[PDB]
């Protein structure tokens with residue numbers, strides 16, 4: 001099924017280490033930075049710039065220069081327990097507020 | 108299109124049980140309209156499409172075995188209404204449950 005892992009157990013424990021995740025990108029000259037994706041929980045799927053969070057399983061693609069790994073992780077997979085552990089709710093809410101503001105302003 | 112994870116509801120006009128209830132009208136679908144309302148959902152008037160007033164998360168194609176709260180948690184686990192009403196341990200229960208549901212059947 002599509003649905004995102006909101007348990008405290010990672011969906012892909014084989015990608016639980018940074019170094020495991022880093023290797024998946026290989027050479028990588030997409031708009032957004034591979035080290036920063038890896039720190040944000042992501043590993044490469046091996047097609048385009050598709051990445052998945054090792055924990056929540058959540059997938060993201062089509063990275064723009066202005067799109068931040070942690071920020072996009074929170075936008076789209078807010079139930080992620082890796083996210084919650086690494087950044088912690090005060091960060092997490094401010095970024096939700098930031099997003100939900102933009103969506104309720106120019107849009 | 109991304110789900111609202113703030114403590115402020117995306118559709119405050121549907122914040123009241125009363126107001127959500129009125130959206131259904133005569134409801135022919137397999138899931139109970141009051142259970143849906145209590146769980147934050149209101150109807151679009153397009154088949155059994157509903158959305159949470161707070162997170163804005165949409166759900167459709169309701170089978171008889173699908174509970175509003177469980178589905179809310181499955182698909183929109185960041186919803187703060189959900190968090191306020193059920194607690195995180197309820198949410199975890201549901202997710203622990205669905206993951207393990209997946210795993211036994213294969």
Ligand SMILES: C[C@@H]1CN(CC(=O)N2CC(C)(C)c3nc(CO)c(Cc4ccc(F)cc4)cc32)[C@@H](CN2CCOC[C@H]2C)C[NH2+]1
Pocket residue numbers: 045050051052058059060061062063064067072076108
């Ligand atoms: C960095 C940003 C991310 N944006 C969102 C995005 O990437 N999302 C949102 C959503 C979570 C709904 C989503 N779900 C899927 C399906 O699982 C996939 C595809 C996938 C990704 C990685 C994989 F390993 C395998 C499959 C992408 C995606 C991008 C904008 N989105 C691009 C896709 O279409 C929608 C549009 C809003 C811009 N860049």
Ligand SMILES: C[C@@H]1CN(CC(=O)N2CC(C)(C)c3nc(CO)c(Cc4ccc(F)cc4)cc32)[C@@H](CN2CCOC[C@H]2C)C[NH2+]1
Pocket residue numbers: 002151156157158164165166167168169170173178182
């Ligand atoms: C009660 C259950 C719910 N299931 C999941 C479901 O309904 N989801 C999951 C997901 C969150 C990805 C999703 N995103 C959209 C797009 O917004 C919509 C469509 C929508 C709903 C209400 C609206 F106001 C407007 C649009 C449905 C939907 C149902 C199974 N899903 C049905 C849709 O296709 C996928 C399949 C897994 C079974 N019933």
Ligand code: NA
Pocket residue numbers: 130131132133150151152
């Ligand atoms: Na109706």
Ligand SMILES: [Zn+2]
Pocket residue numbers: 041053054055056057058073077080081082083
């Ligand atoms: Zn994640």
Ligand SMILES: [Zn+2]
Pocket residue numbers: 147159160161162163164179183186187188189
């Ligand atoms: Zn909600």
